[PDB]
């Protein structure tokens, strides 16, 4: 409001191009060891999906 | 910091009250105008019975 301020309205072409880097990257996902579903790597696969580790059960 | 509005019900009726308005001919017109504008309240509503 005070000291600086924009001098001209930015074109639709110019905000849209600023946003050319705003796209998301879809999650990284692997199929679980033995349980059915898809899970993110290096994590406790939400349907119990660990052997030598615990799992907090879905069971 | 202490502001302009420091409510005090006695003061409010002592000052803009109906009986106060009726004393002064100046006040009798205030009623007359408000009553003719069709104001729903002729006078600041005050309470604390």
């Amino acid at each position: 409001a005070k000291h600086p301020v924009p001098k001209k309205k930015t074109s639709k072409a110019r905000r849209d191009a600023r946003r050319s880097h705003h796209a998301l990257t879809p999650p990284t996902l692997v199929p679980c060891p033995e349980c059915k579903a898809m899970k993110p790597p290096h994590t406790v696969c939400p349907e119990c999906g660990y052997y030598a580790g615990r799992k907090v059960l879905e069971v | 910091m202490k502001r302009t509005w420091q409510p005090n019900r006695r003061k409010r009726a002592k000052t803009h009250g109906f009986r106060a308005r009726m004393r002064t001919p100046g006040g009798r017109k205030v009623l007359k105008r408000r009553r003719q504008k069709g104001r729903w309240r002729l006078t600041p509503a005050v309470r604390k019975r």
């Binding site: 796209a23 998301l24 999650p27 996902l29 579903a37 | -």
Partner: protein, 113 residues
């Protein structure tokens, strides 16, 4: 056949949720689900609901077989604006607008043999 579900007047900014919608466009339903579950956005929840409501319209209303439907089309349009006052320094009052989206997932069966 193709089937669609529309969540309207969803109290979220179009530009915000549009971001995850673009994440499922053209994809299998199977994949799309797996994407929304782990997409870390408030818009996931909503888009999830619209998608699942769309499938539940293909199978029960249009006969489409859940195992063959992809996200043929999807988009979100700008619902009406919730103008609210934001009190500011030196007695200003701005108006922030809580935005609103119209989510439209539209499903079709994959052209598989």
């Amino acid at each position: 056949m193709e089937a669609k579900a529309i969540a309207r007047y969803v109290r979220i900014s179009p530009r915000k949720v549009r971001l995850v919608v673009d994440l499922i466009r053209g994809k299998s339903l199977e994949e799309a689900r797996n994407i929304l579950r782990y997409t870390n956005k408030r818009g996931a929840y909503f888009v999830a609901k619209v998608l699942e409501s769309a499938a539940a319209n293909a199978v029960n209303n249009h006969d489409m077989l859940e195992d063959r439907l992809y996200v043929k089309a999807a988009y979100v349009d700008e619902g009406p604006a919730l103008k609210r006052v934001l009190p500011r320094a030196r007695g200003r009052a701005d108006i922030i607008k809580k935005r609103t989206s119209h989510i439209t997932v539209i499903l079709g069966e994959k052209h598989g043999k």
